[PDB]
Design a protein around this ligand. Sequence first.
Ligand SMILES: [Cl-]
Ligand SMILES: [Cl-]
Ligand SMILES: [Cl-]
Ligand SMILES: [Cl-]
Lengths: 188, 192, 191, 189
Amino acid sequence: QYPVIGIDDDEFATAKKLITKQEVRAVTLSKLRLQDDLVMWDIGAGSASVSIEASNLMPNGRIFALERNPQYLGFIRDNLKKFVARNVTLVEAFAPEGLDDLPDPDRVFIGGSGGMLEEIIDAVDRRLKSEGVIVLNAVTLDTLTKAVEFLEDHGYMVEVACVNVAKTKEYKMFESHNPVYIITAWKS
Amino acid sequence: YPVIGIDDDEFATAKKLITKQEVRAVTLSKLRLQDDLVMWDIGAGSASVSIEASNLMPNGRIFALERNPQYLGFIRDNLKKFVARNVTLVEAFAPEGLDDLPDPDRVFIGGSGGMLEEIIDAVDRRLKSEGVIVLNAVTLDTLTKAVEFLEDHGYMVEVACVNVAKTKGLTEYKMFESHNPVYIITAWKSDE
Amino acid sequence: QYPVIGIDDDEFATAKKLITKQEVRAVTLSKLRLQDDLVMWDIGAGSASVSIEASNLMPNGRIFALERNPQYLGFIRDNLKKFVARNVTLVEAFAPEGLDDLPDPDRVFIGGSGGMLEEIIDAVDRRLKSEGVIVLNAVTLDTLTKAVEFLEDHGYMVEVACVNVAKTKGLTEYKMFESHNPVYIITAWKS
Amino acid sequence: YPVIGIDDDEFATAKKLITKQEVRAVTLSKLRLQDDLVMWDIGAGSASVSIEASNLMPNGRIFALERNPQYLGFIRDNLKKFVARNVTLVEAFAPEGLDDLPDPDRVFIGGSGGMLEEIIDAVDRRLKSEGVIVLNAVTLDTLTKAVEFLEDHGYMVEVACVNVAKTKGLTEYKMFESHNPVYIITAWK
Ligand SMILES: [Cl-]
Ligand SMILES: [Cl-]
Ligand SMILES: [Cl-]
Ligand SMILES: [Cl-]
């Protein structure tokens, strides 16, 4: 038995710095404005933690987890079978390659672009359904800069939320995670 | 409306009362919700936590306790608007009014009304096996005493300080505006 | 009767949202790598709180505070008199106009651009002394973006520090932390 | 070396010990320093706060208390490196060793070493009129207790939680890396 959202980060097969951590994952899910029956793309899925929890939010939605890295693909395989996330389909693809075969998306999360950010945004803009939402998480200045630029260029309203989290595990010292910029884009 | 992430301005609320959207999502995460559970929301305010919790537990039962008459009207209006039928609004000044409720799997404490120790004691007696208590604190006194009382009762306690800054406007002047920090306190028994 | 740095925000003649607030002001001064005998420009001075505290840190240094808003020039004239900042010269100008007549700077603080950010950065770059340091404070994404771009274009090493401050007033424990908006302090220098 | 804002890597220090430069600047700011004052730095660590405070008060008098042998090593190395002649290193564990110091105008508590309550009480009996106490706290326990004990003694307390995240100098991959939060607690009568 796992919670609907808020699965502990340690339960995912992952690498250091790869996982969308629990708290930011929850905010990311929230920004995606999910409802049942939608199609969602998770570009650069990593460990697929965002996909897995989104699948719990949309039991009859369809989630397409895209990842090109062989090590990460192994993580995802192990996770999808641990968490019984049957409405998630793993797709081996270097986005924007592999998107043409996917059904039109209501929701797109961009966890990793692999140097292809502008190309992914353009490809997604052409495919995104009416009332669609794009969410990206960014930890670097260049990705933050360029994502805001490219989304605004396509006429998206854009919100940027910078989320800082510090936690005590005794002696309770607050340890900070690095900041995550959750960028949310839609048509008004 | 989405399952979670309903815009703050869609709720009938007062200034400084609502559990704002980002922090709400983290709070629900920390609550470790699954369907069919019983949840108490003590000091419900606008009941935004109760309402999104109810979306995550369609077959669960949520009990939202609120003492303030102005906030009761907000709740009534919100429950109807968002169709949160599995939330029962309970008019009470907790720990009063907890007795008629079923034992909780999950308790969120959003407001104590000067009754923090008494609420934690009452909740601790009732809390089911593998239960989780979450509290959102914005003052240092609440943060200090909540950690102190929960640790007295043998709970494992995590504190997560969540700082959110967001842009708005439309373009050009995309300035980050900070929310005030919120301390999300999660307590559970390491035993169970 | 006033400290070297950490002068209360209230003691400056100022407008709402104008002042570089105390904590951020302190970090800004720290990033400015101040030592005595230097020339500093403070572009878009506001109330000149940055110029004033820098003046305490460099008593034998020379500071030029540029501002053209007539109201703010009043604030600066008041504040320079109140705090006895004699080594600060008020310059009535909207940068990059009014920079030509100034001595070559070792340090430049850009507190306000008036939409002339690129032109200000270009002007400053041509003039900045060896081992010089530029500091800017950005609150918008657009300023953050363009500043980093324009400074990297001119070949500077650029550090961005995002500073978040949340404070209790006065009851302290019975009293919510109130957050200031984040400030991006951008520090630029040649390696 | 600058008057304030000396790069953290220039001090002899250990992991997690130094008052990092941004927070150090805010701390000096909160200390309300002016020349000719007497300051105590209790649990001085690497003495980075005392050193930069020395620059702010050349004719002031700073007493840096430390008795961890490794940290005393760092301090001696640092004072020699930065020319901070108005800093006296005092080998002691507060509140003992405070009786040998002159009455302070300013007190920074950087490390209490389990003696927080006793330190605040001893400081309170000695602090000069218009004096300022500053403490940097990173645990909830220290935050809680400092605030309680300072208000117990009739101080007006400000707590400023400072979060700093920063990139590096290189253009390639500018990721914001967070320092842990620091609660800078300022107290005055
Ligand atoms: Cl992940
Ligand atoms: Cl609410
Ligand atoms: Cl100013
Ligand atoms: Cl130090």
